[PDB]
Amino acid sequence: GAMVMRLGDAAELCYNLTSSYLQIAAESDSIIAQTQRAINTTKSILINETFPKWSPLNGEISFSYNGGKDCQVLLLLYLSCLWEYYIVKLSQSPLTKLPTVFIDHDDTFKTLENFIEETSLRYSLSLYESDRDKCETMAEAFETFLQVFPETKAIVIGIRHTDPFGEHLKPIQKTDANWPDFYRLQPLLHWNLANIWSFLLYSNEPICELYRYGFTSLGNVEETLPNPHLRKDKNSTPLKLNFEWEIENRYKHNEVTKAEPIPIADEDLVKIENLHEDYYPGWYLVDDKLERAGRIKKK
Ligand SMILES: Cc1cc2nc3c(=O)[nH]c(=O)nc-3n(C[C@H](O)[C@H](O)[C@H](O)COP(=O)(O)OP(=O)(O)OC[C@H]3O[C@@H](n4cnc5c(N)ncnc54)[C@H](O)[C@@H]3O)c2cc1C
Ligand SMILES: [Mg+2]
Ligand SMILES: [Mg+2]
Numbered sequence: 139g140a141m142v143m144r145l146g147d148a149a150e151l152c153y154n155l156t157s158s159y160l161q162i163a164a165e166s167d168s169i170i171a172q173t174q175r176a177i178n179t180t181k182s183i184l185i186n187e188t189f190p191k192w193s194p195l196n197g198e199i200s201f202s203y204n205g206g207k208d209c210q211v212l213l214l215l216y217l218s219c220l221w222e223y224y225i226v227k228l229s230q231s232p233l234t235k236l237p238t239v240f241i242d243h244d245d246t247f248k249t250l251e252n253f254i255e256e257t258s259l260r261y262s263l264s265l266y267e268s269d270r271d272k273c274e275t276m277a278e279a280f281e282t283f284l285q286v287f288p289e290t291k292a293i294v295i296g297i298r299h300t301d302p303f304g305e306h307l308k309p310i311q312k313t314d315a316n317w318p319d320f321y322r323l324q325p326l327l328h329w330n331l332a333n334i335w336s337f338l339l340y341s342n343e344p345i346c347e348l349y350r351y352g353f354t355s356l357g358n359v360e361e362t363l364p365n366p367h368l369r370k371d372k373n374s375t376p377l378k379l380n381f382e383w384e385i386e387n388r389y390k391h392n393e394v395t396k397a398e399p400i401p402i403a404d405e406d407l408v409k410i411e412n413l414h415e416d417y418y419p420g421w422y423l424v425d426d427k428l429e430r431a432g433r434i435k436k437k
């Protein structure tokens with residue numbers, strides 16, 4: 139409509155859409171049923187283990203966000219859990235913006251930069267962005283962040299066990315010794331790729347449009363390609379879509395919640411359209427072993 143949602147509207151939206159997903163009558167061997175179970179585990183981590191220990195309201199928690207599919211799903215679930223914890227469950231504790239941190243780099247996709255900005259508006263994020271043109275490690279960028287915000291005790295991260303170095307991660311654990319000292323809150327670890335697509339497509343939230351063009355994992359602009367397993371060709375078996383129901387039945391909006399388009403950036407569209415190959419969108423990939431296949435070959 140005429141104005142951006144307030145944080146309470148966004149949180150209530152996320153609670154309603156998550157609740158609606160949980161009410162889908164899905165077969166016990168389905169992706170949707172598995173995703174419902176994943177939601178419930180994430181909710182337990184946030185509602186039972188996280189919020190009672192660290193305040194999401196007063197700056198003790200910041201949310202790490204770069205606009206990708208995994209941290210976007212987590213943000214939706216996190217907003218749902220804020221609403222459930224405080225409004226539905228009446229837990230003891232107004233917040234206008236959610237403290238958020240993005241580590242920006244000189245080789246980030248322009249589409250992602252745009253999508254982070256536009257979703258920060260939609261979700262009422264209070265967005266800290268590290269310096270794009272400073273050469274520094276992620277740990278060093280977070281050390282600066284913690285100097286600015288020394289009240290921060292914990293940061294939410296949308297990492298999954300299937301990501302590199304994800305095997306041994308835990309839902310709540312300290313950073314390593316060579317990092318600034320804070321707790322990592324990692325409530326998405328048990329999600330797999332099929333779960334991410336199912337929920338994100340059902341949500342009817344805007345999704346970074348690189349995924350529409352066949353990306354399944356967003357690394358830097360030089361290394362990242364559309365996923366080769368999603369290349370269209372005349373000779374191979376055509377891919378089938380596992381998420382037709384979710385797209386057809388995606389959560390409906392009203393005048394407050396309707397979403398403005400977040401288009402692909404022109405500079406990325408030129409690049410993609412000049413591959414001489416076309417790709418299915420990323421949600422045609424459900425094999426976690428192949429999530430990072432769209433990368434330039436290195437020696
Ligand atoms: C707050 C935080 C604390 C960390 N602490 C440790 C640590 O103690 N030891 C260690 O070895 N590694 C640490 N890491 C690194 C982390 O484990 C991943 O290796 C890193 O986020 C890059 O992820 P990826 O690109 O492989 O995967 P992706 O799947 O692309 O990203 C996984 C998640 O990382 C976060 N993320 C990735 N890139 C950015 C970015 N540019 N800005 C903000 N968030 C981003 C998002 O929440 C995202 O969902 C930390 C990362 C973060 C964000
Ligand atoms: Mg990811
Ligand atoms: Mg900047």
Ligand SMILES: [Mg+2]
Nearest residue numbers: 206355356357
């Ligand atoms: Mg990535």
